[PDB]
Design a protein around this ligand. Structure first.
Ligand SMILES: [Mn+2]
Ligand SMILES: [Mn+2]
Lengths: 137, 137
């Protein structure tokens, strides 16, 4: 059967600024780069940045809610979010509708998130503060 | 410090067909559903489907290369691809890289992939046959 996410590939409009964002600003590990892409890891996540002439820099009001959240510990969350803010990283959402999260944009407007907590923890929180109509299986 | 992918959230135009696709066709585990979304798991992956009226059913020619690949074993790959084909799921690309890959679309046009092989396997292949301009770190 399917066993998890093998990789996440993000189309990027300018490779070097995107590599810098994920490696330098977010601290991911850069393994290789070439004229049209890069491979990074974030823990077990395999991230591929793919240079795509079709990628547009997209304001958050023009894109849907599809987004990519990265795990961070409770001890590191606030200072990492504050560092992104001080670095001028654009945002896209303020209301914490799914727990302790910071919502920010990559250089092309990909919707990213820092989140503290697992699915199990989110389900437990939702049992007390459920979303409208919520059913648990 | 970021420790991995926390969750992937896909915006969906119609919740019921998206739940059917990910739970029933793709075999993911449905943990909860509410009036405007669902939580599923696939191995370690936490998947959220978020009902979003801004999601367009998007032809593959009209979206960039951003895509989400799920892991499957080599032994299971061909029968899973055949299941998708029987269900009439559209393909958006043929495989031309190392490791088996099946490129298929979700009901809203999210670009998905089945892939066999790790980052380590890809890097080993690239070391032997580097892409144009490739540098390793
Ligand atoms: Mn999220
Ligand atoms: Mn891929």
């Amino acid at each position: 059967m399917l066993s998890g996410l093998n990789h996440l590939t993000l189309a990027v409009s300018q490779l070097a600024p995107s590599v810098a964002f994920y490696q330098q600003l977010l601290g991911m590990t850069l393994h290789a780069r070439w004229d049209s892409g890069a491979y990074l890891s974030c823990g077990d996540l395999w991230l591929c940045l793919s240079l795509d002439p079709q990628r547009r820099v997209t304001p958050p009001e023009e894109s849907d809610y599809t987004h990519y959240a990265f795990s961070i510990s409770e001890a590191d969350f606030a200072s990492f979010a504050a560092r992104l803010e001080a670095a001028g990283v654009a945002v896209w959402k303020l209301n914490r509708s799914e727990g302790a999260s910071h919502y920010f944009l990559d250089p092309d407007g990909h919707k990213l998130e820092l989140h503290v907590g697992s699915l199990a923890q989110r389900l437990a929180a939702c049992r007390e503060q459920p979303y409208k109509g919520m059913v648990f299986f």
